[PDB]
Amino acid sequence: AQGTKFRISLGLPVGAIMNCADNSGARNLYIIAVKGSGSRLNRLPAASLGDMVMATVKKGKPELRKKVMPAIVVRQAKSWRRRDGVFLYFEDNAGVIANPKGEMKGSAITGPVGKECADLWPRVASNSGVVV
Template sequence: GDVVVAAVKSATPQGAVKKSEVVRAVVVRCAKEWRREDGSHIRFDDNAAVILDADGKNPRGTRIFGPVARELREKGFMKIVSLAPEVL
């Protein structure tokens, strides 16, 4: 659920974002295990982020692949949660 500033490492040829572009993104999956408020631990298989638009709340894309963390709902990223196929 952290918002980070990142550089695009790879992009599709006709995509909206270009390689080496500096963007704001929210982390939706983290491979490093972390503890939730209820005491449980959660860990994903990979690291993933969703690129955000200029206001920093809505995603620039219209599709999200794979599960996202439940903490996004608490931080107000409802559009990302609604697009995700699964919320863990």
């Protein structure tokens, strides 16, 4: 489901609590896995801007809580290197929740969206207000 993306710096390991950018009632997401992650002894699998993570809701609507459901990172605080040269980074981490196809459950996104997420996922760019 996930296409080709150039490697960017991994800023979100397992156990991170990122914000929730959409309007599906959830307040923050708790990352428990990264889809397509590697395998190394004692290594925590880490996420990045645009990866697809399995995540639970720790705060928000009680209907959304206590179930594991996939999510997509839209902002990142660790600085990454774009190919055209610049090192950039947002202010906080953020994610939106999705079905395992990649379609989005929320209606809109507040805050800016990273550009390598809008190219990779077609639904996130449809609901994005500001692209970087």
